[PDB]
Amino acid sequence: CDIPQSTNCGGNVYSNDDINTAIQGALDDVANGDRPDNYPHQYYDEASEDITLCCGSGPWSEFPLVYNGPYYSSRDNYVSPGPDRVIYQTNTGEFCATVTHTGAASYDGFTQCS
Numbered sequence: 001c002d003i004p005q006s007t008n009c010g011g012n013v014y015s016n017d018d019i020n021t022a023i024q025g026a027l028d029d030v031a032n033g034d035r036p037d038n039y040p041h042q043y044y045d046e047a048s049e050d051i052t053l054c055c056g057s058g059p060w061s062e063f064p065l066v067y068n069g070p071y072y073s074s075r076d077n078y079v080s081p082g083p084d085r086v087i088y089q090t091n092t093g094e095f096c097a098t099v100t101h102t103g104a105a106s107y108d109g110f111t112q113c114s
């Protein structure tokens with residue numbers, strides 16, 4: 001669905017441009033070094049998380065939603081991704097959701113941004 005004008009992820013308000021920039025960064029990922037970068041990586045639907053996606057069919061990926069983006073990190077040049085993510089359709093780039101680890105029901109998992 002359309003990239004929203006803003007989102008509130010556990011108290012961090014991001015703009016449409018922050019969200020777009022995150023997806024752009026994810027789509028621009030290529031091979032480097034000796035292993036995959038941690039992000040983007042696949043997102044899976046977990047019933048307990050109560051997350052609704054607004055793109056259609058997957059596959060889906062997650063990428064960090066950060067200020068001053070896009071996020072980038074690699075082996076030996078680690079930068080924290082923080083708790084917030086964009087979910088997008090892995091192949092098309094379509095926006096699916098913004099999610100966050102902040103306030104989630106597990107420490108590894110997600111809840112929908114508000």
Ligand SMILES: Nc1ncnc2c1ncn2[C@@H]1O[C@H](CO)[C@@H](O)[C@H]1OP(=O)(O)O
Pocket residue numbers: 062081082083084101107108109
């Ligand atoms: N605030 C946070 N920052 C970094 N990783 C987090 C995180 N909260 C949960 N994680 C999870 O901890 C592991 C190490 O980063 C990953 O599985 C990651 O899930 P994620 O990649 O889906 O965000």
Ligand SMILES: [Ca+2]
Pocket residue numbers: 001054055056094
């Ligand atoms: Ca659509």
Ligand SMILES: [Ca+2]
Pocket residue numbers: 005015016017
């Ligand atoms: Ca704007």
Ligand SMILES: [Ca+2]
Pocket residue numbers: 029030031032036037
């Ligand atoms: Ca890469």
Ligand SMILES: [Ca+2]
Pocket residue numbers: 045046047049050051052
């Ligand atoms: Ca769901």
